[PDB]
Enzyme design. Structure first.
Site, PDB file in Angstrom:
ATOM      1  N   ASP A 153       4.754  -2.136   8.074  1.00  0.00           N
ATOM      2  CA  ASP A 153       5.729  -2.476   7.038  1.00  0.00           C
ATOM      3  C   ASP A 153       7.069  -1.783   7.303  1.00  0.00           C
ATOM      4  OD1 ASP A 153       6.505  -3.648   4.401  1.00  0.00           O
ATOM      5  OD2 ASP A 153       6.540  -1.533   3.788  1.00  0.00           O
TER       6      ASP A 153
ATOM      7  N   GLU B 185      -2.302   5.187   8.659  1.00  0.00           N
ATOM      8  CA  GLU B 185      -3.140   4.129   8.101  1.00  0.00           C
ATOM      9  C   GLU B 185      -3.874   3.309   9.162  1.00  0.00           C
ATOM     10  OE1 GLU B 185      -0.087   2.246   5.814  1.00  0.00           O
ATOM     11  OE2 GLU B 185      -0.813   3.060   3.904  1.00  0.00           O
TER      12      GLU B 185
ATOM     13  N   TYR C 254      -2.000   4.098  -3.906  1.00  0.00           N
ATOM     14  CA  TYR C 254      -1.053   3.429  -4.792  1.00  0.00           C
ATOM     15  C   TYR C 254      -1.700   3.017  -6.112  1.00  0.00           C
ATOM     16  CZ  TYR C 254       1.964   3.301  -0.701  1.00  0.00           C
ATOM     17  OH  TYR C 254       2.731   3.652   0.382  1.00  0.00           O
TER      18      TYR C 254
ATOM     19  N   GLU D 284       1.776   9.248   0.873  1.00  0.00           N
ATOM     20  CA  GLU D 284       2.407   8.038   0.367  1.00  0.00           C
ATOM     21  C   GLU D 284       1.924   7.786  -1.051  1.00  0.00           C
ATOM     22  OE1 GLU D 284       2.613   4.387   2.416  1.00  0.00           O
ATOM     23  OE2 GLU D 284       3.014   5.216   4.411  1.00  0.00           O
TER      24      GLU D 284
END
Lengths: 582, 582, 582
Positions: free
Chosen positions: C164, C397, C453, C488
């Site tokens: 990303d 990740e 998240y 993150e």
């Protein structure tokens, strides 16, 4: 006098000093403490090249008054060593191992010094102090209150600029180290005479043509002749020049170009030109006035995207790295000096004896004419060999209609004509309120460059009424038989503000503003240029009339377009570089 | 004199006329053509209630000068019929079948007329002309140039308001039709005396208490007594009053409330209060000044969300529908009259004989004192029975320090005290530059309400220096032994503009501005109120100093919050309504 | 193997090649035409160092697939000459006078070549081709469709990144030329042992301590000892190291620092640390991934402004110029390799035989383990002497819970421990869905670094429910007896979007998101770090889920703050670097 852009040659090195240096703000008690001798203590860090004002946090930092100290270690011996500071803003004192070496008044032009004498073996100390104070003896000019007075000057000492942009200071442009043999080239000067039915004069001081792609050619004070390819706007072409002298080599790019004025026509290679462009700034985030090669190359793309051809170095000489970059891409440039702020009607004029002071009062007014001359010399002694430069601007918005105006600019206009081996046009851009019968530029400048805001500062938001005044003043300038160019016209616009029934500060009013003006420009065949103000948004001093800076740009500070950038792109798509008027 | 808010009762109808009407802009040749007789031709459509200025497209429409024509058909007879226009801005002529019926000078207060006489059987024609011209004889006051002159008055006729908001005009508030028996109630007046160790005086003109939930109680010129539940800020409680008279019924909600001043204390039910809130506006999109019940109820939510309690009807009486809505929710209100613009120092003052004109010159100045009185009467004769109203503001920012100031406001201050059957506090809010020793309000008003901008208009962006002036002027007001309240203080802020090193117009400067001021307010125990300016952004006349209107709001015009709305919400969370000072 | 940061020394030159070069996009028919031999024709201009993708206009330019050609002339001879490219993204072929010289697979790490052999006298030609293709054999990893598939791969060839962020390519970092005597230093390695009741091991390869201010000290494979000043976060201190060898000098800055893990504690100089910071990016406008010394120094200011101490080189090694800059200011750094995209569950995993492909399938999966190793070597062989580096991140990740996970990372984890002469902690950051009992990092990494998240991708906009899952998963990680850090967590936020009743993408939801998470982090004493994602907004590939890029930043791309930057600044103001947990 003469400065040549350093570059790797067979005879010359080029060691860049750009990087992160040691940095300290002066607290007064600095020069007596002789900080220039010992390495800085309690030092912060600051990249070079850059303007320091925006790289640390705090008003007390951004708005600092006085000196700052850059420090750096150096090391290397058979060749002539020289330290060229491409620009220091504004004043600079270059110590080295404590012993002073050079000084320079001049914020946007280069200077070099000799290095062989002094210097040591290694691990010797370099210190550069930078001052930011501006007053009536500096170019640009600093006043004694805010410029938009139509905040009281009180308590703390500060700089109050007489100009609508921020006082970004520091080592704005790079610091390099090149070497030369004891015999070196110091200046090159090449000229051209074209037979439009192609000879290059080329003096040197203390040689082979080369063609674009590199196919070598003629060889040889000098002279040349060939069947040439013309340097054109949006169609560049640079011959190369390899100077072979006393075991020293310097290469030079050159373009074949002819500029002259035939009444209401600006001739570029004997064709009727039209300026399509902007007034620009060296303004990025967070570099301030520091040099930014990406943004330079990026704006060039946008300008070709937007179908432009011209822009002006408002309001100071730009970087060498950009002028050459304008030679490669074929962008017409109007070069300009640091002479902005020579006007004491801005705000409330100074009041020595209870009564206002004229701009050119001999005792209580501008004291810049001397330094003004050196800037014209050092500038033309630097950019004389750029085909992109088709004109010099001696000043931006000065008191060109007051007592002393003519007698001030006359010797400067002549020095401009004396030192340009091409006899390029010369001008100054005129404040609002200046008319044809009252401007010292009406009979001094070869072209009339105007800064007018009919529909914004003067007449907004009534666009009907503002149009009448613009026509009335424009018909009155045609009676000179000289070309007329607009160098500033715009309207503050906050990106994202809209309405169908447009009001001021919206993206729609900004378009209607330019729609009205351009509708009038086209009605007159002596207008040979429209240059928008500004290209992008940029930072200024804080005022009620400044919404986080000057929002008059067509683009934002991060170069994102407003709705007007698409208006001008559609308009400038069907307007040629040549023959729009004929 | 007396107007009662219409509502469905056993004796009275209420037929709303709100809807889309026929509309035409006057072109001069309108009244001679007798448009009021025949139905409008070439008519456009316009909703009622609303301000027309923003509902059609074009400058010529939004900025129209003169009359507009609303038209509508009507139909229905045994009862007294009456047509109450809740507000027409500014002047109104109400024709009907061509024959004039009523007129009204007054833009923000209701008026009614009789209907039985004239009127026909059905399909009879109603016409309402509305005028928008303001001058020295109107409230609000219109000048002869732009207000921010520290655009030239030229060519076309227009309105130049002496106030910083837009001239939204038209049938702003609803038009209804209620009926009455030939004998009707015309006014109710109820008072209270509380024993803080609970008796209600209640005159009537040409009766049963009821309690909140509806459990009926005492019955009966009148009088009552009970063990009452107190109406409190953020803790409302409304008894009901059912007036049974000559076969006519009107119901009335009432709150038990006590307001008085004991030196440096504002007493609400004998407790030391503190104003937490805003100056507000009737300003939405696209209704303009028109009434918007959703936004009213929505702002109330936001105010409770933001931990406020007070606000001011700046700068005009609001809607009846909102004042009652402030009774239900328990919001303290500072009611204000249309007296804004009574100041001829704004811009460049008028110049009759080559020299400036004072505000209260008898020949070339304000001619409003007569109409000023009726507004005080009609306002208090309307909002006298609202517990939310704890004070009257006779004027906003007038020349309260010029020759004629005292002699102008004295009779108005007294008329205010004469007609309020509760003897509420009275005041006017003071322009900047007004000091304690020079203000006609220093010995006239029961509380000192200030509008000061230390750190914006005066001192920005230097927040250190601006703090010194704010303390200096605030210590100088304490010497009155009266309470001091701030009714305006703010800083223009464009939503989305940010920086870590804050400059003006950013969301960060706006917070630092309020941080500095509130830091000084807390240093003084006679400051009993902070009211921000403004609650939300709103539209103004076009000027260089107005970025699409007044951006000083904590919220945007669509009620979205800025970073300062969260500052005030955290601050006002730990400040009580009572005892913050003691 | 070993690369030393070039700098002006008594023995070594340093000629920077940064500037505007000749540039051409490959059209396929490029290498057969042998463009590397003759100077480029029809060439455009491109500054170096910079990513080209954003410096010209057009999708076909920004999204180009294949090779680009940088060209440049060069000139100078008694010393060892060497050309170090600080970084080329991704693959590079360095021709010179047509004859190839070097090649490099590796987009974010430096490499050098020898120059004495070949080279000529002067006016010899330098050509650098750059390739941008990414696939299963590259680091970072490129897939075969868009990453956010939970636009069809069709027609035109392109790069589909498995990560990303945008594929900014070109000569991102500078190109310089330094010289050495035929005998030179090639690597320095210095270590420390502190007696917390101060000895420096210092091998060299083919010496005098100096103290901060420059007061020289001890002299001398080597060794030293002194009473030292500790390098601390937000309290840096760098000794100098002057290596005097075979008539060659290289100076080195060093900091005294100790890092180790004692269960649930991260020890920096035997004190209990807490990470306060961000995941960052090399992302500016318009430089792309190119180096920007001002923004580097500017972010450091903002980080100290915001009361931070740490950040992570997500997701690639940064510039040498920044790592040293982090040594000077005292910023804790988590260094990271180019290993992002090692996960074939993103989007729809590749499908060779009608069935999905695991990440570490030997035939149809990731083929990076070899090049993965060299990156770990070249990275640690570069940043081994930075006190700011307190940890290495082997990957971002990856499929750390699939068959092949352990057997893939085991040799990489060991190579990391083998080559760091300080035995620093090592880790990898874990995708969402990874739990303690299923992660190859649960028994491999010395610290647990999570990317979670809860409340955005997983659970938004229900912040109650999302909190339950965050606690449930966080209690389940405590059972390792290892420290847990969040690398993150964030929420996309468009600057200027607001509401009192917050919804997703508003500035208010972003704060509530972090309020919920941080409320849970504080409930657990094994969480030794919160690192926000992201520091600033940055550009990505185009997708429906990407509103002009990744808006999860606390600041905007022009570094202007959002409302959350002020939340974290107030939070991190009362959280110390040491003892927040104890």
């Amino acid at each position: 006098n003469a400065m040549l852009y350093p570059v790797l040659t067979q005879s010359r090195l080029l060691s860049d000093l750009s990087g992160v240096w040691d940095f300290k703000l002066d607290n007064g008690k600095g020069f007596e403490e002789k900080w220039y001798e010992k390495p800085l203590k309690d030092a912060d860090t600051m990249p070079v090249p850059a303007s320091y004002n925006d790289l640390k946090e705090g008003t007390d930092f951004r708005d600092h008054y006085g000196w700052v100290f850059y420090q750096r270690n150096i090391s290397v011996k058979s060749q002539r060593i020289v330290l060229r500071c491409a620009a220091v803003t504004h004043y600079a004192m270059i110590y080295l191992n404590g012993k002073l070496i050079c000084e320079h008044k001049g914020g946007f032009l280069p200077f070099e010094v000799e290095l062989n004498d002094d210097l040591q073996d290694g691990d010797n100390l370099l210190t550069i102090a930078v001052n930011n104070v501006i007053d009536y003896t500096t170019l640009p000019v600093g006043g004694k209150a805010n410029m938009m007075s139509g905040a009281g000057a009180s308590d703390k000492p500060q700089n109050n600029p007489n100009f609508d942009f921020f006082n970004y200071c520091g080592i704005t442009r790079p610091v390099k180290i090149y070497t030369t043999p004891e015999t070196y080239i110091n200046d090159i000067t090449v000229t051209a005479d074209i037979d439009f039915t192609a000879v290059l004069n080329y003096n040197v001081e203390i040689v082979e043509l080369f063609d674009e792609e590199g196919t070598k050619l003629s060889e040889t004070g000098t002279f040349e002749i060939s069947n040439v390819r013309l340097w054109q706007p949006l169609n560049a072409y640079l011959y190369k020049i390899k100077v072979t002298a006393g075991q020293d080599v310097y290469t030079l790019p050159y373009g074949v170009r002819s500029v002259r004025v035939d009444g209401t026509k600006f001739l570029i290679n004997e064709k009727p030109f039209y300026f399509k462009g902007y007034g620009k700034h060296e303004d990025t985030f967070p570099n301030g006035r520091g040099i930014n090669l990406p943004m330079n190359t990026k704006d060039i793309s946008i300008m070709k995207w937007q179908h432009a051809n011209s822009f002006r170095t408002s309001h100071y000489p730009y970087s060498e790295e950009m002028m050459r970059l304008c030679d490669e891409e074929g962008i017409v440039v109007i070069d300009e000096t640091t002479a902005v702020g020579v006007n004491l009607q801005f705000g409330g004029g100074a009041n020595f004896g209870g009564e206002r002071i004229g701009t050119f009062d001999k005792e209580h007014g501008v004291q810049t004419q001397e330094h003004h001359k050196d800037v014209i010399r050092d500038l033309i002694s630097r950019d004389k060999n750029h085909a992109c430069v088709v004109m010099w601007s001696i000043a931006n918005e000065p008191d060109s209609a007051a007592e002393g105006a003519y007698d001030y600019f006359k010797p400067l206009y002549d020095l401009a004509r004396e030192l340009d081996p091409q006899k390029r046009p010369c001008t100054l851009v005129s404040v609002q309120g200046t008319t044809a019968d009252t401007d010292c530029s009406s009979q001094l400048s070869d072209v009339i460059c105007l800064n007018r805001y009919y529909g914004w500062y003067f007449g907004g938001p009534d666009l009907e009424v503002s149009e009448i005044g613009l026509r009335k003043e424009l018909s009155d300038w045609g009676k000179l038989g000289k070309p007329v160019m607009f160098t500033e016209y715009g309207a503050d616009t906050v990106s994202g503000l809209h309405d169908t029934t447009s009001v001021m500060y919206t993206e729609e009013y900004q378009v209607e503003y330019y729609e009205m003006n351009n509708k009038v420009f086209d009605e007159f065949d002596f207008v040979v240029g429209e240059q928008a103000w500004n290209f992008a948004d940029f930072a200024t001093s804080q005022s009620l009339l400044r919404v986080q800076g000057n929002k008059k740009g067509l683009f934002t500070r991060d170069r994102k377009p407003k709705m007007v950038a698409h208006y001008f792109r559609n308009r400038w798509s069907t307007i040629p570089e040549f023959g729009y008027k004929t």
